[PDB]
From a paper:
To fix the relative orientation of the two domains for structural characterization, A95 and A214 were substituted by cysteine residues, allowing chemical cross-linking between them as there is no endogenous cysteine residue in BbZIP. The inability to completely convert the A95C/A214C variant to the cross-linked form, presumably due to the highly dynamic nature of the transporter, led us to use mercury (Hg) as a cross-linker for structural study. After a brief treatment with EDTA and desalting, the Hg2+-cross-linked sample was crystallized in lipidic cubic phase under a Cd-free condition, yielding a structure of BbZIP in a new IFC conformation at 1.95 Å, the highest resolution for BbZIP to date. As expected, a Hg2+ is chelated by C95 from TM2 and C214 from TM5, locking the relative orientation between the transport and scaffold domains. Although the cross-linked A95C/A214C variant was briefly treated with EDTA and crystallized in a Cd2+-free buffer, the two tethered metal binding sites (M1 and M2) are still occupied by Cd2+. The coordination spheres of the bound Cd2+ are not significantly affected by the rigid-body hinge motion of the transport domain, but a chloride ion (Cl−) was found to coordinate with Cd2+ at the M1 site. Rather, the anion may assist metal release from the high-affinity transport site by neutralizing the charges on the cation and excluding the otherwise coordinating sulfur atom of M99 from the coordination sphere. The Cd2+ bound at the M3 site, with an occupancy of 0.84, is coordinated with two histidine residues (H149 and H151) from the intracellular loop 2 (hereafter IL2), D144 from TM3, E276 from TM7, and an ordered water molecule, forming a distorted octahedral coordination sphere. Although the IL2 of BbZIP was found to be severely disordered in the previous crystal structures, Cd2+ binding to the M3 site stabilizes the IL2 which folds into two short anti-parallel β-strands and forms hydrogen bonds with the rest of the protein.
Numbering used by the authors: 21 to 309
Write the structure that this text describes.
């Protein structure tokens, strides 16, 4: 039944297109106007922090692969900690006030986690892009400009970070939105440096690589629109979407980032980066309040 694979392909494609487009459409309804406001501003702060990091690449231009793998692990560790403490744990509390505490509330967040993996896995199959380890991925990718493939890798990476900012603001609760957005925005400064350096390395002169890195940061306000929309349809959509954004980010770290550091032989340097970034975000979870 190749009809069945065509049916699943149609449902898969429409399901990811629908999530993104219906998220934006739902975000733009009148009931969400205040929440979208906070979420896009949070996203625009991440764009600004990305821009700042990218500007710092004009000085460095290129770095040892060992240093690059450390910095990628560092940003990755910050995002694992942001997923755990700024999305999963508040999602648990939010779920508990809707369905009751205990494992039933964890089931809300856990199902969202799985939905986030499925969304990113589907985008990973349908979006042509390229990694320096496994080469080009996605439909028709072998005959796509290689710089553009790497740009799309960066776009896929930052979609969940934008979505997380949107989800965290979906109820107007700055107690949730500010810690999450602070974590992503601080992480975006080293990340903008890594992105500009990686774009330079795939063939752009440093000045154009910096400008493309700055433009890539616009995925965070855009993804924040998606996050607002998917998290606001009904009361449970909010803790489910917390888990969804967390699972999408965890996929980016474990599927997109950490594998790039392992096959170069710098598993050990990436690991010290992961530990430091995770520890740092824990600290900032309590120092920033
Ligand atoms: C990489 C992914 C990029 C996706 C590209 C974006 C695709 C979406 C393009 C245009 C969407 C326009 C939505 C306007 C919403 C109208 C709701 C108007 O509000 C209303 O209907 C009432 O207020 C209800 O309360
Ligand atoms: C509420 C959460 C919704 C999340 C959506 C999850 C459902 C889809 C999840 C994963 C889809 C992966 C399918 C793999 C496609 C195989 C090559 C397909 O590549 C191709 O060749 C195409 O023909 C190109 O268009
Ligand atoms: C607020 C955001 C402002 C930023 C606006 C975006 C600025 C975009 C800047 C530069 C993009 C131009 C790319 C240069 C050609 C790349 C060829 C690379 O491919 C090649 O090596 C050969 O051409 C192969 O075809
Ligand atoms: C919401 C997030 C939006 C993010 C937008 C990112 C904008 C990035 C802008 C330009 C990417 C430059 C790489 C393209 C390589 C092909 C150059 C073109 O090759 C060429 O040289 C022409 O064929 C001849 O001039
Ligand atoms: C409470 C919420 C639960 C959330 C669960 C998310 C945590 C799981 C995240 C990452 C698992 C580790 C991924 C790396 C694969 C390790 C062996 C992979 O082995 C291999 O195949 C390669 O050769 C080496 O990497
Ligand atoms: Cl990351
Ligand atoms: Cl250069
Ligand atoms: Hg980084």
């Amino acid at each position: 039944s190749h009809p069945l694979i065509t049916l699943g392909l149609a449902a898969s494609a429409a399901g990811v297109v629908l999530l993104l487009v219906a998220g934006i459409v739902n975000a733009l309804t009148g009931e969400n106007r205040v929440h979208v406001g906070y979420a896009v501003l949070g996203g625009a702060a991440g764009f600004a922090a990305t821009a700042l990091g990218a500007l710092m690449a004009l000085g460095l231009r290129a770095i040892s692969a060992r240093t690059q793998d450390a910095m990628l692990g560092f940003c990755a560790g910050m995002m694992l900690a942001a997923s755990a403490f700024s999305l999963i744990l508040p999602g648990l509390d939010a779920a508990g006030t809707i369905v009751g505490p205990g494992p039933a509330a964890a089931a809300v967040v856990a199902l969202g986690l799985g939905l986030g993996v499925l969304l990113m896995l589907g985008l990973d199959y349908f979006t042509p892009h390229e990694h320096e380890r496994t080469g080009h991925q996605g439909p028709e990718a072998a005959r796509v400009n290689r710089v553009w493939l790497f740009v799309l890798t960066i776009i896929l990476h930052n979609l969940p970070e934008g979505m997380a900012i949107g989800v965290s603001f979906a109820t107007g609760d700055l107690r949730i939105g500010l810690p999450l957005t602070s974590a992503i925005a601080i992480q975006d400064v080293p990340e903008g440096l890594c992105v500009a350096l990686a774009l330079r390395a795939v063939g752009l002169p440093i000045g154009r690589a910096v400008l493309v890195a700055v433009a890539s940061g616009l995925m965070e306000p855009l993804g924040a629109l998606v996050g607002v929309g998917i998290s606001s349809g009904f009361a449970l959509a909010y803790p489910i979407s917390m888990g969804l954004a967390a699972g999408a980010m965890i996929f980016v770290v474990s599927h997109e980032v950490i594998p790039e550091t392992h096959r170069n032989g710098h598993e050990t340097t990436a690991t010290v980066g992961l530990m430091a970034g995770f520890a740092l975000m824990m600290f900032l979870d309590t120092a920033l309040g």
